[PDB]
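Work package 3, deliverable 3.1, input record:
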Amino acid sequence: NAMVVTLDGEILQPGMPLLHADDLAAVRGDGVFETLLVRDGRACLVEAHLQRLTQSARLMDLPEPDLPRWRRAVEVATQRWVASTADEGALRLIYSRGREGGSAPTAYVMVSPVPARVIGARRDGVSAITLDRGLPADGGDAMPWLIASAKTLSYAVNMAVLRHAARQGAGDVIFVSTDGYVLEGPRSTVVIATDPCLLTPPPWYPILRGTTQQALFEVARAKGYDCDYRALRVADLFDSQGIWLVSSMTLAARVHTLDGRRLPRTPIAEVFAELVDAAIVSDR
Amino acid sequence: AMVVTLDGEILQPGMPLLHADDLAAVRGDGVFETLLVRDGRACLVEAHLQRLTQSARLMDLPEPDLPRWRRAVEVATQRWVASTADEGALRLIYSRGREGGSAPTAYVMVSPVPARVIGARRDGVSAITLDRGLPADGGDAMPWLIASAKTLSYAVNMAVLRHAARQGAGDVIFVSTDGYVLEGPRSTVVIATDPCLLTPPPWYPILRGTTQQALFEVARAKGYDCDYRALRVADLFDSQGIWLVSSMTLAARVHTLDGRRLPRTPIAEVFAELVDAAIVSDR
Ligand SMILES: Cc1ncc(COP(=O)(O)O)c(CN)c1O
Ligand SMILES: Cc1ncc(COP(=O)(O)O)c(CN)c1O
Ligand SMILES: O=C(O)CCC(=O)C(=O)O
Ligand SMILES: O=C(O)CCC(=O)C(=O)O
């Protein structure tokens, strides 16, 4: 089922507990993490995930992550998963503040099966609803204490928002600020397609920076696509050629229905998935 | 630290309890409660198990088995009471369980009361107001944000406290973007206006304070009028006193707010006594 690789590089026995009852990841969600996709024998975009992991650790007053130590744990876990199966894997880096009163932070690497919801979201897409996030667009930089750009282990609200939309037949959520500007998804980055130009909310918004979105901008710009960071509104969502919820594991899930209103399908939608396919391998 | 799971086992300390895929650790996905052990028993057990039931309901968690929770609490309490007469910090950890699994994670943990608690009770704290990022109407207009649930996802709460620590402040008072007083990152805000006690209303995106409510009950019987009002920052500086009330710290008087020192009022002498009798009013 689940596989664990500590920073020393040894693979822990399945079915055995790793974390103590007083680890700050469990009692207070006090830590940062990253999620990587294993595809065709290798984890995708390792450096971009370790770069953001280094930034999330700085925003959380966590010890600076040892990148050579993290690269070995991911490489050991990667080769163990690829040897075990040819299916894609969900590789996650867990970096917590450690036990209460202790000094050493908790850090390990975990590979798990990719959920079945991913193959449906890639192939079929998702129905999404816009939901008030409660944050204004100024929240990321003007209010740094909210650390909205840090990918922390405190994801209880993100999961509850998804369950709220599930009870209403929605497969995902697009967060909208009190100002009326598009922010992000609870687990993905919002990218739209306008005439052909791809847009995404600007990074000074209280949102996470998408590793997949930036790599998508690199491959798309090198192929002739114009990309930019703009203040998107809900109206701009409905007039686009396509909306996608982009992330590291789900890759690209087009929003075919937004707030119950179906959105038309464009020829750019078949190339968009290929654009995200080349993005996660642009490191190779 | 001592751990007593709802299964009934007392774990040998220094041994791991949770697997690497527990949703408490990978997603902060769970609810918890913090209780104070004083004079041989945890304080306001029933009121904390009631809020645990409400936080679990907002989180689509299985309804907690209160008789099993009471056993883990009683077993963990007497193990601490047997070891020392000092106060203890008892916490109920209730998570969704392992990723992909079905059984939820549930255990009770007792630890020493931190040294910051003795100072906050005795001396008080210097606090700063900080924007919470939520509007005051956000609790009712956005129920999906489950701001009334006491979850294990306290990364923002702890980061906010560290930010104020770098500025010489001992705690924080959250203010909404609309400018209304909400709560602390780890406490409930109670102020003193003319002998009247006020606190922000619970339909705000805040937690309902078990200690604050038990305080309102004892205070009303002693002649004080208590009520829930929409407080602004001006009400903080014009008040007779500000306290950050909670289950473990009890009452932490704010002696300095945003750098401005606040005078001491005769109500400051009585307030600590009111919270002491509040947390044992169940007995
Ligand atoms: C809040 C949030 N925003 C955006 C993203 C997308 O980031 P990435 O492309 O690196 O997966 C994620 C990752 N699930 C996320 O949790
Ligand atoms: C966010 C928050 N609000 C309020 C409180 C106070 O609640 P209670 O008096 O029931 O402990 C706490 C306790 N730390 C808290 O963490
Ligand atoms: O599993 C979840 O709900 C979120 C994980 C994620 O980021 C994803 O869907 O790829
Ligand atoms: O989050 C908690 O409840 C623990 C902190 C607390 O209650 C306190 O400091 O009094």
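The first helix of chain A runs from residue 24 to 27.
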